[PDB]
Amino acid sequence: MVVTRIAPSPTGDPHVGTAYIALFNYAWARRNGGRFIVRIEDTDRARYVPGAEERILAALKWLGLSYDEGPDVGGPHGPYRQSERLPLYQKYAEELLKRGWAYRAFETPEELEQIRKEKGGYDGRARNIPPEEAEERARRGEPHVIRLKVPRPGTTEVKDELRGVVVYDNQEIPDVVLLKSDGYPTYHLANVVDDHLMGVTDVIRAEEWLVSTPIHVLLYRAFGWEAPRFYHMPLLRNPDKTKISKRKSHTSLDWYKAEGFLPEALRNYLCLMGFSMPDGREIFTLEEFIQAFTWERVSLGGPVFDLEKLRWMNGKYIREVLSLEEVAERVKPFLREAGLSWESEAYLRRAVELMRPRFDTLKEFPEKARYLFTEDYPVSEKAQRKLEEGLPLLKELYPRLRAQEEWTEAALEALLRGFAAEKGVKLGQVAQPLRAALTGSLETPGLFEILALLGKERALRRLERALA
Numbered sequence: 001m002v003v004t005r006i007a008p009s010p011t012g013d014p015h016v017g018t019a020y021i022a023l024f025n026y027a028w029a030r031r032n033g034g035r036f037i038v039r040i041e042d043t044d045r046a047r048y049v050p051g052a053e054e055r056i057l058a059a060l061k062w063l064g065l066s067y068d069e070g071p072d073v074g075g076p077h078g079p080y081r082q083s084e085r086l087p088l089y090q091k092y093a094e095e096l097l098k099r100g101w102a103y104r105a106f107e108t109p110e111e112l113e114q115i116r117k118e119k120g121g122y123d124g125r126a127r128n129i130p131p132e133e134a135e136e137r138a139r140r141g142e143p144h145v146i147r148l149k150v151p152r153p154g155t156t157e158v159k160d161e162l163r164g165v166v167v168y169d170n171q172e173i174p175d176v177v178l179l180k181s182d183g184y185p186t187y188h189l190a191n192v193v194d195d196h197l198m199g200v201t202d203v204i205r206a207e208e209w210l211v212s213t214p215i216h217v218l219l220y221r222a223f224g225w226e227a228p229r230f231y232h233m234p235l236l237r238n239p240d241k242t243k244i245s246k247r248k249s250h251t252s253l254d255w256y257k258a259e260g261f262l263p264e265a266l267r268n269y270l271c272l273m274g275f276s277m278p279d280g281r282e283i284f285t286l287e288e289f290i291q292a293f294t295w296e297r298v299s300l301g302g303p304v305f306d307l308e309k310l311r312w313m314n315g316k317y318i319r320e321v322l323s324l325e326e327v328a329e330r331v332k333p334f335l336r337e338a339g340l341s342w343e344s345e346a347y348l349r350r351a352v353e354l355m356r357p358r359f360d361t362l363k364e365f366p367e368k369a370r371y372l373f374t375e376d377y378p379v380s381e382k383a384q385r386k387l388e389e390g391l392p393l394l395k396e397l398y399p400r401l402r403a404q405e406e407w408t409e410a411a412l413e414a415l416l417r418g419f420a421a422e423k424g425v426k427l428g429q430v431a432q433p434l435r436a437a438l439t440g441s442l443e444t445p446g447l448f449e450i451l452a453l454l455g456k457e458r459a460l461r462r463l464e465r466a467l468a
């Protein structure tokens, strides 16, 4: 049975990289009728932010993913937070000492810097301290760390299921710290101990972890454990091919959610980052992704995460995937956040229908259609000048509009058409100023559709205000 996992180290915001990796772990598990678990690697007591773990779990669920074991759902091999299993790492570190696969090192930071400048890294000199002396110094409270005792000289072979076998000269592998001086584990020790105890059979993670694998293979060998299958996914890249980073761009899943990106669209886009459908389709469901999933179609090149492409897909979901009713429901939270209400469901549905071809994110709806839900809408600098330019035309138009009994799109259109001819100007010279007066914008949907949507009286009210 296949068992995959995600092992996020929460820091602040839920990272899009976590969603990307989670997506493929979830797919590989489901495709094989296996299990997908969540382990929180929260031992970094400097980067701990209350609520960060919860935000990650919520984002995974928001994206439509689900997991089988974890901090909140529980499971047969918990605890699922590394902060709750600190004693395990220490006992396993002690086991390595007993096996001769690890040793205590007492160098101060000043000493390590000197050694690094002389040898290019730590040279394992502490391996020459008599074991019994190292234990006594430890018993006496001397500060130290426990390092992996890499076989010197030697070689370590590592197999990545997508890239193949890599033969490392052990001289490329340092005697990495496994247990820190404060008793906390390093990533290498905790990751191997927990993947083993949780029964992980398939490790799928970002390629930046690839070079850490030989260390993990040595640890599995040291404990006498069977190593799982390793799959390293390409890192998400910026247009310039550099690695996407939270310090350089928007990687927060909460930002995407707040910006009005649909979970189904973001999920669909992440699928396209490390995979392509046989037929080439770009729009598909999570179920279809799983059914068609195969490592044979996972590219190893750097996938470019293009925000503009994401917005395009989001827009395609808004007008071609979801129903009008679904969109109207989803824009509600954004309307309320913008301090806007809607007279009725029928009205809202109509507003969404008119704006649907004009917004790519749910957040843009309240921003571009504010004038449809409140009289307190902003008037752009460009719209104001256009209104001013056509004010005299509108003033002469006001009377005709007030007398207009048939307040429909076709009727109003005919009225402006005749008026424009009467004044010797093109229809647009009258339409633009009117649009500005009724919406405070020059970029809106059908002027005539907007003219009649609000009703005659309310429309005249705004024209009056612009003429006041």
Ligand SMILES: Nc1ncnc2c1ncn2[C@@H]1O[C@H](COP(=O)(O)OP(=O)(O)OP(=O)(O)O)[C@@H](O)[C@H]1O
Pocket: 008, 009, 011, 015, 016, 017, 018, 020, 206, 208, 234, 235, 236, 237, 243, 244, 245, 246, 247, 251
């Ligand atoms: N470009 C990327 N593609 C895929 N996964 C990534 C990428 N960057 C980070 N990750 C993954 O996202 C998670 C969070 O990593 P991290 O908090 O270091 O964010 P970061 O963007 O790498 O920030 P930093 O530049 O400081 O390293 C980790 O699981 C990491 O492997």
Ligand SMILES: N[C@@H](CCC(=O)O)C(=O)O
Pocket: 007, 008, 009, 041, 191, 204, 205, 206, 209
């Ligand atoms: N906690 C590590 C886990 C890496 C792994 O998949 O082994 C990270 O932040 O992704």
Ligand SMILES: [Mg+2]
Pocket: none
């Ligand atoms: Mg990073």
